[model samples]
Target: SEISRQEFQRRRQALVEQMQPGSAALIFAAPEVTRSADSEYPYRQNSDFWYFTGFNEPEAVLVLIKSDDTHNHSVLFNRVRDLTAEIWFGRRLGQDAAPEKLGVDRALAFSEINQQLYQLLNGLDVVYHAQGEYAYADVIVNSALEKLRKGSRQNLTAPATMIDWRPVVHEMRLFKSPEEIAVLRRAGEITAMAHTRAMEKCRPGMFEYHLEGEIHHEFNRHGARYPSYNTIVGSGENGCILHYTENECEMRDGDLVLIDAGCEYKGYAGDITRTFPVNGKFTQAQREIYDIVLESLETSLRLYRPGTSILEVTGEVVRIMVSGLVKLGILKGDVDELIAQNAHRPFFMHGLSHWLGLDVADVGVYGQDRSRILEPGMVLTVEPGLYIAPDAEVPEQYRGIGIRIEDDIVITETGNENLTASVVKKPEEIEALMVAARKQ
Candidate 1:
């Protein structure tokens, strides 16, 4: 379901208040990048831009101007569709209806944007824009500034400074609100179900793509229109590739399949990754690696508290994982030395957590220092994994085994809540679910 208009307005108001006084902030919807001559890439709104203004369509820009003596202002400039163009393509929420529907103070056609922006920007001490980030928007803003300077026949002046707005806005979005958390909870529920369905339907002979289809189908069936990211269904040695999404190989009976998939609802995303056996039963070797990874994630979750820092949690998880690897004979070094030298990186690379919200990898400042503290209403993912390639000179039992267990969590005032707890990660629980599926 679409987010309520009130929620969008409240978020916008907070952002406007957070901005420096007397500065104008400009944010643009993502431009449709062309894939070929006529076709275009799938349109996904820029998360930060969309967060402030719930304007989903392309070719739209939002302008916020704060005044010292007068009331602050918000305006939206959007495409004025041509009749012939609308007939060929789909209908547009043209200038006439955008203001009322989008809950903005004023709205104008895209044609009039230059004139309006020039007037709004003139005499402003600072111009805040997502500069350098959105190349197209940067070019547009620069061109507008240039035109305003040239057309100033009178004693009008242009903005002397252009400040990048991402840092300010991204920090606001880092902490989730009650409304945002509710939407993410629903998204996480659907994502968990998709993973469970994929696990139940998986078989020895089916291709990994078939499992991906199952997951995407589950997401769409639950009303989510898109996966948060590319659905990864990597089996056996393929799981060693962290971002593996080329799910085209046939599932082998004894191979473990690692599925990293999630769904987005109302811009909030739920990220989950689970690895299970293909034939509904784990081999002794696979179980050993899987258990350690699961334990690492569990340990990380226990450390998620109000005063805890992401770095502290990560450091502890790394220590635990290094110890586990040493016990498994995968590495031959002291635990401290392995962590100090990052020797386990080849097997267990990537950070264990990231802010998850409006974007899959949501925007937020990590912290004032190196460690971002776990604050209430902050949503994150705790994912840990160990991957051993097929040809690696590791223990014979441990070679070619890859396992990852991930879950979405939300920090509360005292502790944290596991939003994806329904998707079981415990070795016995996962084995039970797989066995029950076979009986069904």
Candidate 2:
């Protein structure tokens, strides 16, 4: 299900409710980026702006005015309709329709933003704007305040205080409303199915980019036209590179392939990483490394719930990783001492998890050292991984091996809900699916 228009209005109202009397907040949409000469990249709306307006065009700004505790209204400055421009590009939600379509009190042409902004902010006591977010937005706002500052004879008063709205807005985004969670749940499912399809289609001697195509096809058929981020298809030694996106290598029989990919559905992100054998069965060495990473992810899922923190659960995962490594002779020394020294950093370098929503790594405060307490309605990813360099001074069998397991989760009242569990990660399950695919 999608977020209703009423929900968008509610979000706007909630932000306004917290605003100071006689103040205003200005939110700017994303500017178009050029991909090359005379052509522009695909447009994506700014998450914060989309959160409130659900409008998807550029050169737009949302202004929320709180005249007093009891009176507030919203004004939108957007593109004026142009038929010729629409023919070359696309349709624009001109001022005439924005009021009824986007639930705003008034709409003005974006070309007049500089001339109209000062009038809107005149006599306001405070202004809430995200400084340094966009250079153009900064120029527009700074120019407006300058106009009010010099118009004292005309009875216009510039706001005395300017506060960044990002902190307040991001805090609201950290906690998902029921509607937001529903969209995220669907995103998780679409991403999981894509990963499952890639696993079944994978075979020795196929190029990594081939699987990337299959995954993208799966996402498109499900109505998600884009991935939340770059699709990663690291195979064998390439898997040691955490952010590997160059899917140009061939998949060999004895190596493992790590596919870290996800899709965007209704502005929410689904991040998932799965590692499996290219030959349809994991070798003994690959299984050992795979088991450790799998245990870390499973333990994280178990310990993650309301009242728990990421740092707390991470400690448990560290213990599991260090213990597993010791058994395989990949690490030495006492588990406690090794943990205290953070000896696992070489193999496990990234955080155990991150908040996920409109952005893949969604905006939110993790507190210092990521100790923020888990609460119901928060969506996040539990990803744990291990990478051994090809040249690492470790046992030959363990060298050049990389493995990771990830799942999208939402903290619930009792424990947590795994939105990506529909895709199997157990060794036998992975092998079974791949082997059965070969039978076809």
Candidate 3:
């Protein structure tokens, strides 16, 4: 299910609870981007604004005013309803119904935001805003403050202190609420199901983009109207290239295909990656490489818990990678020396994990060396990868090989919960799945 209106209100209250008395927090929605000429890109609400209001629309702002510790109110300035415009574009919540619909104390027309903003912010001791996040938002806030600043003869005063609300709001987003976990759980399940389908349907000779289409179709059928980000379908040597989205290659029988895809459900994101043979059976070389990445991911999931951290878990994964590469003759040094020399950088690059939530690469502060301690309600992805370049000096058998395995998890009380484990990562399980599908 989605985050309830009450939950959204609670989020607002929580943010307000941290504000100084006689303060206001301003949140602006994302502006519609022009796709080309007459059309616009898909509208996605700003995560911070959505966190508090869950209202999706442009030309809107959420204003939270704190008069005191126990006294606060919210205002929503949104597009006014116009019969002709609604008929031409889409429906709008409009001013008349926004208060009840969005649980705000008051609503006003967005067109008059400049006229009304200074009045609401007048006499406040502090203002919480994310300056420079959006140029338009900055302009509007500056105009409002200027009006209040110069209206002293009219007994008006601007807030003296301005603090960026992004840090506070992002810290709040870092921890998922119970309801948010529920939504994320569904997102993980749906994403896993899509990956599983892609594995079962993949066939040699099919274009890499064909699998992308299948993945998107799976997401759509399951109620996720969009992928969290651009889907990656890298086949053969293309797999060695990270962030490869030019999915135009033809899958070859003996080559492995790496599909890094995810779905966005109810504004939460699910990120997952799976690599398997194009012909449904891993070659011996491919199996060897995949095993290392898989082991790293498996080990990370087991070790991620409260009191532990990404850096700590990553150290373990690095050891596993260094040792595996040495065994395969990919590196010619002691495991500890290889790790210290950063030999794994050429192959096992990228952080082992990242915080996941509203955005695919969600917002959160990872301290120096990504040393932030894990805590309950913190969600993240454990993704470990190894990419052997096509022309690298590595053994011919290992060249042009790339393998990555990733899963999303949430730190819990005793340990951690794996949210994306419904999909198979085991070698035998993958082969069995593809084999079973081939019989059909």
Candidate 4:
């Protein structure tokens, strides 16, 4: 479910609590970008910008002004909808209605932003705006500053300092509240169901795109407006390509399909990936590769507790992959030397995990340095894979096989919770699901 208005208000108040007193912060909603003259990409609200303000409408700006007197000084500036504009495009929350409806203390039209911003800029010690992100916001803020400078003859003093506001907000979002976690759990559940459905319905002779359609169909049927990212349904040797989203190939009788997909719910996201054989069973070679990747993922999950850094966990997975490659004769060297020369990357590429939350590849600092540790309330992906191209010089039996197993996890006080545990990953379980679907 979408967050209530009170939830947005509580989120904004939490952000205000984190701000340095007597400072101001500014955030702007993402503007629509055109693909061509008459077409536009699907609009997604900026996660950080929307975190504090649930107002998803584009061309809106939020100002968080911390006052010494403390009389609810936060203000919102947004586009005032014109009936003609609404007829051509869509509706907008106009100025007067935004304050009560969107839960802002005050609201004004975008046209009046310059004059109002100038007035608000006076008597503030530091002006905080997201630096270098939105070019238009930078220009507008600069113009407003210039206006304030010229109007100083009327005794208006410009801000004494300016600071980048992104770090403050980014740090704040790193810790998830209970409300945010609940939404993330629902998103994960929906995405897991979609993945399970795709696995059950997949069969040899089906087009890779058909499998993608099944996954997307489940996502939409369950109320997700869109996948968190491009649904990757790479079959056979196509799995060797990390971002193989073209999904135009046909599944072969003995090939394994790798699907990396997820869905969004109420602005939160859940990312999961699984690889399984197309024929409801895996051959000896496929099982050999699949088990190694599965083991790596299982071992990696053990390191996701508090005090573990994502980089450290990735390093552990790389060590395991390198050792597995040596065992499979893909690389002929000790594990340390193989990793030192990046010998495992020719087959196993991409990191073990990324932060996951409101966005699919969610935002959070993995580490400022190697020693940085994971904290509770943070969510991450633990994915490990091994891909061997058909033409590669490895043993003939292991050729043309690719395997990746991924799950979403959240750090807990004692350990971690697998949010995607409902999705089957065991080879036997996946084969059973496929067989049952075929029988049905």
Clashing pairs in 2: none
Q: If candidate 1 were superposed on the true structure by all CA atoms, what would the RMSD be?
A: 1.8
Per-prediction backbone clash count = 0, 0, 0, 0
Q: Summarize candidate 4's per-residue lDDT along 41-84 as a digit string, tens digits.
A: 88888887788777778888899888753644678999897999
TM-scores, all candidates, are: 0.95, 0.99, 0.99, 0.94
Give the Cα error of residue 160 in candidate 3, in Å: 1.7
**lDDT string, candidate 2, 72-149, tens digits:** 999999999999999989999999999999999999999999999999999999999999999999999999999999
Q: Rate the local accuracy (lDDT) of all candidates.
A: 0.85, 0.94, 0.93, 0.84
- Model 4 alpha-carbon miss at residue 320, Å: 2.5
What is the C-alpha lDDT profile of model 3 across 28-81, one tens digit per residue?
999989999988889999988899998999999999999988899999999999
RMSD score of candidate 4 (Å):
1.9
Q: What TM-score number comes out for model 2?
A: 0.99
Question: Over 4 Å off in model 4, which ranges?
Answer: 69-72, 336-342, 368-371
How does candidate 1 fare on TM-score?
0.95
Rank the candidate models, highest lDDT first.
2, 3, 1, 4
Number of the top-ranking candidate, with lDDT as the measure? 2
